[PDB]
Amino acid sequence: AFNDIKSKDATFASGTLDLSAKENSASVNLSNLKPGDKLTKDFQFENNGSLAIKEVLMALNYGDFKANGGSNTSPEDFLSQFEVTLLTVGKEGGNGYPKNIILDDANLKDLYLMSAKNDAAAAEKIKKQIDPKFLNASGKVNVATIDGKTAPEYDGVPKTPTDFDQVQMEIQFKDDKTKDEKGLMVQNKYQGNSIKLQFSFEATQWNGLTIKKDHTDKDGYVKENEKAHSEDK
Amino acid sequence: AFNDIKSKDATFASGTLDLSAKENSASVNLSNLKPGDKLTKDFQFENNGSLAIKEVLMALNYGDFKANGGSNTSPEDFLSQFEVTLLTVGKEGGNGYPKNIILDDANLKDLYLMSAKNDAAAAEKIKKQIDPKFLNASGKVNVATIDGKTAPEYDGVPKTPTDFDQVQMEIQFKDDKTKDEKGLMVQNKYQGNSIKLQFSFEATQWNGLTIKKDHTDKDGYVKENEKAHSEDK
Amino acid sequence: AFNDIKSKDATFASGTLDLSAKENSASVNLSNLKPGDKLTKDFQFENNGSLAIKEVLMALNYGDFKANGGSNTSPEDFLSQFEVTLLTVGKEGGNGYPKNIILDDANLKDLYLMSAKNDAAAAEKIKKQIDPKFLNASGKVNVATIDGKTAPEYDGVPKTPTDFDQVQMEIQFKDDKTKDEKGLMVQNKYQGNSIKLQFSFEATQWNGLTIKKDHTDKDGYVKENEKAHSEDK
């Protein structure tokens, strides 16, 4: 009836990831628009968590339709009259490519349908008129920098190399320009209409990583999780 | 399986534009006319909408031909016997030019043909006998003030500077004065003829404008859309 | 692509003028005349149209020459043997002048030549033997009342003041009284000759009038066109 007991110690901890997503826009809210006008919106993404981000996914949503004086009461019709002219993921950041236009004259009705409802036809049309490599199966659009040939480490706003990503979007109020036989043009129905837009950004983290001696620090913390390309094959 | 969501807000609104087009004429309807008589009509244009007008386009239409006792039953022949003597776009308004006569002894048959049917020959004849700078490809005649050297801001009845445009038109019943061999003059056929005229005014808005920080107000509303020369190059 | 349409209404009408020209003569047709005889013809002019007359112009024409038994076959020679003794434009009408004789022993050959053929010599002779103020460039003779100092409004048989104009003409068969050496007098050639006379009256309207607020009625009709002196300077 002889025995002995030996024990060992081991502590496990988990990291966190946060997204800043500052606006820095010129006006944020615009009113009294007329057809043919062009808008401008900016976004700045920075890392505020221990873990390293991989990409940021953009979603579009609407609400609070008013139709004060127009003859149109369908929010979808009003939203369909706004075309997003360009979406530059590079902007001021000179890492790798200075500026990159992933957009080719898209629309917002299609973007809403393929971003929230995940409609098949809208997704097909967007993929026909957008960069294929900036899309995901979920339907959202990647906005963070990707595939940096000069500096692969500056991919998906990591933390160990201090990186911030600036993106520009240009929104244009399309004019239809078709005159009726009576003499009143059809786009007159969108007079006084007001809509609210919801711009949602989702940040994801990389895949799993097999931890070895080199990846971790001298004791405790792992440094590889804070850097880009942390995931294994 | 870590992620986070960030959202942003944005509201878009559209403006409206309206035209007042008061008459203020002396008699509006005139009867018992005889050849050689001269008429007088007035019009006052004011802005009643959020957006800023660029020009007002005038159209002419007829209807309700009666021919009570005359031997003429063609409305075109009766309409061809009225010449519009003058069309003063300035009138009482002293902004820039006090008075400007854009018309040189025009006719109403030609005006109808080049204003509604858009006939090529009538348009050519009018352009030969009218001011070229007050015309458009659509065929209608601009009536609002334009090219104000003293005050460029008072162009096309804007809203931010309170402007109203007064226009006069003079209509004369032309006499033909050719006597037949029998002794009855030919213009006797237009005795008792009555016609109704439709004076249509169309107000258009400027072209697209690229919105920047200076153009918009402190928050929301844009002031540039309410002023003249809002459109870009 | 914003616009709006405004329209206005306007109706134009034209008046008519008619002449009554009743005869009221004693016998109308006279036969079996002999030299030295005197005739009598009357005319009454009234207004039967919306517009207001200015003057009535008289023309003379002949036809249907027979020469049953005379040795003269020229209608001109037979017509030259009738002298119109007097032409009173006043007659029973007491407005202003009761009676006015515009004629001084005229002839009918000269009247025909200066009224239809518009011969220069006949017109000169008539102007030498007629009142200059009752003539026109066309050559016809004004018959309606003119230049009424007491009542200027009763000029040229207007409509608003109910006026009718009565005119008398006296025709005398002149006797030549020259005896030939054989013993047969020359005027014997005009025996059995018969001629038909055409008395033509033309009514004219005033010149053009610039229509203002006072001239027209409350709505529509213009009253100035129904009154004398409607034309402007």
Residue numbers in the entry:
A (entry chain B), B (entry chain A), C (entry chain C): 28 to 260
Paper lines:
In the Gram-positive model bacterium Bacillus subtilis, TasA is the major protein component of the biofilm matrix, where it has been reported to form functional amyloid fibres contributing to biofilm structure and stability. Here, we present electron cryomicroscopy structures of TasA fibres, which show that, rather than forming amyloid fibrils, TasA monomers assemble into fibres through donor-strand exchange, with each subunit donating a β-strand to complete the fold of the next subunit along the fibre. Later studies revealed that TasA assembles into fibres that form the major component of the B. subtilis biofilm matrix, with deletions of tasA resulting in significant defects in biofilm and pellicle formation that can be rescued by addition of exogenous TasA17. The structure of TasA fibres reveals that the TasA system is a donor-strand exchange system in Gram-positive bacteria.
